[PDB]
Design a protein around this ligand. Structure first.
Ligand SMILES: *[C@@H]1O[C@H](CO)[C@@H](O)[C@H](O)[C@H]1NC(C)=O
Ligand SMILES: *[C@@H]1O[C@H](CO)[C@@H](O)[C@H](O)[C@H]1NC(C)=O
Ligand SMILES: *[C@@H]1O[C@H](CO)[C@@H](O)[C@H](O)[C@H]1NC(C)=O
Lengths: 107, 107
């Protein structure tokens, strides 16, 4: 049910892309975004804690990424290296968590 | 830094194994264990929420697994099909999370 949608899916080099998030579970503690197809701390872009309303960069943050309170992710000034897969994890209040994988293509 | 240790590493069929967790981070929301080498909600054994002090089974829970408040995981009555990889994820309060993959061998 949890899914992502890239706006736009095909992104011109140097422009921006917004990863929209649909069907968020109801009771959430926070969000974590990753580069790639896997939840992997070594590739985490950002973590967002809902109660403190706080965004914290992970190792893959480049200074171009913004996360919003509804879990959408904005990436500015995209490069060819940003192309491909991104994985969102949402942390539910029972710690039985959910993932969704999105994608965009820079040309 | 976060590591697991199988106690014992070689486990006789039908006996039990305790996955000890070392180097846990200080500020945490909870823990999640998975069967396999990936964080994947479809293979989640258990989620443990520190604030409500509650364990919640995931799809891979079989009734044989117990998680402790220090994140250690006890699996009773192992079979040869249980051998291999298990993954712990620790959810930090800033949502910059950490993983460790452990392993044991059933003989
Ligand atoms: C994106 O690139 C433009 C043009 O170089 C620059 O003005 C802007 O600050 C950049 N944005 C970020 C977040 O670095
Ligand atoms: C999430 O919030 C952003 C920023 O306000 C907004 O642009 C976007 O439409 C929202 N997402 C959804 C699915 O409504
Ligand atoms: C975690 O708690 C369990 C149960 O009290 C204990 O057996 C185990 O030794 C603990 N793990 C560590 C690393 O202290």
């Amino acid at each position: 049910q949890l899914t992502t949608e890239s706006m736009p899916f095909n992104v011109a080099e140097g422009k921006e892309v917004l990863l929209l998030v649909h069907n968020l579970p109801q009771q959430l503690f926070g969000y974590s975004w990753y580069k790639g197809e896997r939840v992997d701390g070594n590739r985490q872009i950002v973590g967002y804690a809902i109660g403190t309303q706080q965004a914290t960069p992970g190792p893959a943050n480049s200074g171009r990424e913004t996360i919003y309170p509804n879990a959408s992710l904005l990436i500015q000034n995209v490069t060819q290296n940003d192309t491909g897969f991104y994985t969102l994890q949402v942390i539910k209040s029972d710690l039985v968590n959910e993932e969704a994988t999105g994608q965009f293509h820079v040309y």
